[PDB]
C-alpha cells in the first residue's frame, strides 16, 4: 500500500527492448498494479541501472546504450533505470551524501518486490556508475536477503576512498561484486575513480589510471560502461584480466597465469570467484570496441662477449602466426646488458593464430652495438601456452639500427 512508500523520491522505470531511451513505464513502489502495467516478467532476471552525478540533471548518452546492450544479450529480462537525477544534480558532496538515501530507496523497492510478489533477490543484478556504484552498495547492504550481483562501473573516489564498508560499495553488499576501475589518476581521495579494491574481483584496465584514446573530459571514467557494453555484445569473445601484484609487475609480463583462478573474464561473462582477500586484476585494451587484445610475456636473454649497458633502448618486435600477423610492435627497455635476461609484456589487437615466426629489431663514427640471442621464450596469456623461438642459424645477431633478427618456433607447452 502506497501510504508507506510515499517518502521514496527515486523513480524506477522499466524500459523495454524497443524503448531504451525514455522512462515510459514506471514501477511505483507500493502500487502492485503498476508492475503488471509495465509487463514485468516475474520468471526473468532483473537488471537495475543506477546512474552517477549529472550537473544537467539529465540521463547521459550511455544510459540507452547500456539498456539496449542488456536487451541484446538478455532479451527476456527486466531492465530498470533508477531515476535519481533530482538528487544527482547538485553539488558533488551533496549528491555523494544522497547515495545513503538513493541506496535506501532502491533497497526498499527491492524488498517490496520480494515481499509483494515473492520475487527472488538471486534474480537481481545491480549496475552502478560513479556515485551510482555506492548507491548500489548501500542498497545491497540494506536488502532483506543478499542480491545476486553488483557491478561497480568506475565507483566515485572522493569521500568514498577513505569511507568505511557501510558508507560505500563493498564485497559484503552482494553475493558477487565485480568492479571496473578505469580512471584512478590522482592522489588517494582525489581521483575520479576509487583506487582501492571494493569488490570480490577488481579489474584495472590499462592499470586503471587512465584509458586508451582519452589523453570528452569523462572518457576514462565512462570507458568502464563501454567495456561492460562490449562484454554484453561480444559474449563469445570476452577480454581476460590477470591477477597481478602491481601494474608495474603487469607491464613486465610477470602476471599472465590462469591457474587457481588467477585470471577471469571482463564483464558479464565473469566467473563468480569469491576470494579470501580482494584480488586486483590487470589487462590492456584497445582505444575502441571490441577492446580485447592478446597478451604475451616475451623473455630475451641478451648474450655477448663484452660487458655493455644501454639505457632506455627502443625495439620493434613482429609476430607471425597461422591466422594473421602484427608487424613493427614497438617497445622500450630501461636497460639492456651483456648476459642478462629481460622479461616484458607485448599486446596486440590482431588474432595472429598459432605463432610461427618472430622478428626482433633494435632501433638507432662507431660500429653499432649488438648482442647474440639464441632463444626467445614467449608465454601467450589467452591460449595459456609457452612457445620457444630459436634462431635458424647457431645464433641471431641483434645489432642497433640493423636488419631484424629472425626466430622460428621450436617448442609448445600448453599449461592449462
Amino acid at each position: 500500500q502506497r501510504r508507506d512508500f510515499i517518502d521514496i523520491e527515486s523513480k524506477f522505470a522499466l524500459r523495454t527492448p524497443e524503448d531504451t531511451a525514455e522512462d515510459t513505464c514506471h514501477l511505483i513502489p507500493g502500487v502492485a498494479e503498476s508492475v503488471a502495467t509495465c509487463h514485468f516478467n516475474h520468471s526473468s532476471k532483473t537488471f537495475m541501472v543506477i546512474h552517477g552525478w549529472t550537473v544537467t540533471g539529465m540521463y547521459e548518452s550511455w544510459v540507452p546504450k547500456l539498456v539496449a546492450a542488456l536487451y541484446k544479450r538478455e532479451p527476456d529480462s527486466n531492465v530498470i533505470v533508477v531515476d535519481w537525477l533530482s538528487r544527482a544534480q547538485e553539488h558533488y558532496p551533496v549528491s555523494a551524501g544522497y547515495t545513503k538515501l538513493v541506496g535506501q530507496d532502491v533497497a526498499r523497492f527491492i524488498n517490496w518486490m520480494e515481499e509483494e510478489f515473492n520475487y527472488p533477490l538471486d534474480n537481481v543484478h545491480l549496475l552502478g556508475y560513479s556515485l551510482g556504484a555506492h548507491a548500489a552498495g548501500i542498497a545491497g547492504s540494506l536488502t532483506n536477503k543478499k542480491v545476486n550481483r553488483i557491478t561497480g562501473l568506475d565507483p566515485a573516489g572522493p569521500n568514498f576512498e577513505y569511507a568505511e564498508a557501510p558508507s560505500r560499495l563493498s564485497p559484503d553488499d552482494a553475493d558477487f561484486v565485480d568492479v571496473l576501475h578505469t580512471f584512478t589518476r590522482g592522489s588517494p581521495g582525489r581521483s575520479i575513480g576509487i583506487q582501492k579494491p571494493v569488490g570480490h574481483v577488481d579489474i584495472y584496465p590499462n592499470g586503471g589510471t587512465f584509458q586508451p584514446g582519452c589523453n570528452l573530459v569523462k572518457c576514462s571514467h565512462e570507458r568502464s560502461i563501454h567495456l561492460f557494453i562490449d562484454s554484453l555484445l561480444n559474449e563469445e569473445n570476452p577480454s581476460k584480466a590477470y591477477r597481478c601484484s602491481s601494474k608495474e609487475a603487469f607491464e613486465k609480463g610477470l602476471c599472465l597465469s590462469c591457474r587457481k583462478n588467477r585470471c577471469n573474464n571482463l564483464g558479464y561473462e565473469i566467473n563468480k570467484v569469491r576470494a579470501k582477500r580482494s584480488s586486483k586484476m590487470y589487462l590492456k585494451t584497445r582505444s575502441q570496441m571490441p577492446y580485447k587484445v592478446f597478451h604475451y610475456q616475451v623473455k630475451i636473454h641478451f648474450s655477448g662477449t663484452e660487458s655493455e649497458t644501454h639505457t632506455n633502448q627502443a625495439f620493434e618486435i613482429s609476430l607471425y602466426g597461422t591466422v594473421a600477423e602484427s608487424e613493427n610492435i614497438p617497445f622500450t627497455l630501461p636497460e639492456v646488458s651483456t648476459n642478462k635476461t629481460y622479461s616484458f609484456l607485448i599486446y596486440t589487437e590482431v588474432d595472429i593464430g598459432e605463432l610461427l615466426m618472430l622478428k626482433l629489431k633494435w632501433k638507432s663514427w662507431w660500429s653499432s652495438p649488438g648482442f647474440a640471442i639464441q632463444k626467445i621464450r614467449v608465454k601467450a596469456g589467452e591460449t595459456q601456452k609457452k612457445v620457444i623461438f630459436c634462431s635458424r642459424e647457431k645464433v641471431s645477431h641483434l645489432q642497433k639500427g640493423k636488419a631484424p633478427a629472425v626466430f622460428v618456433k621450436c617448442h609448445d607447452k600448453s599449461l592449462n
Binding site: 607471425y320 597461422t322 630459436c390 634462431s391 635458424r392 629472425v406 622460428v408 617448442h411 609448445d412 600448453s414
Partner: protein
C-alpha cells in the same frame, strides 16, 4: 596408446634427432620444418616435440617456408629427408 616422440629444437638439414620423450596422454608427435635464405645461404631446419594441439600447415612467412606435420605413431616425427 601413448607415444614416445622426438624432442629436438631447431636442427640443421643433415642432423638426426637423438632425444625422445613419452608424451602426456592425448599428445601427437610434431615436426616444424623451415626453408628460406639466411645471411649464410639457403638453410633448412627441423624442430620436433610432443604437442597437445596439432594442426598440419604450410605457410611462407616473410620468405621462409614453414611446415608443420602431425603423426599419431611413436618416433614418426622425422623430417621427409630422414625417414
Amino acid at each position: 596408446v601413448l607415444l614416445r616422440c622426438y624432442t629436438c629444437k631447431s636442427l640443421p638439414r643433415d642432423e638426426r634427432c637423438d632425444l625422445t620423450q613419452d608424451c602426456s596422454h592425448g599428445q601427437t608427435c610434431t615436426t616444424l620444418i623451415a626453408h628460406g635464405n639466411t645471411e649464410s645461404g639457403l638453410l633448412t631446419t627441423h624442430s620436433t616435440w610432443c604437442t597437445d594441439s596439432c594442426q598440419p600447415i604450410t605457410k611462407t612467412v616473410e620468405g621462409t617456408q614453414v611446415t608443420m606435420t602431425c603423426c599419431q605413431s611413436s618416433l614418426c616425427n622425422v623430417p621427409p629427408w630422414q625417414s
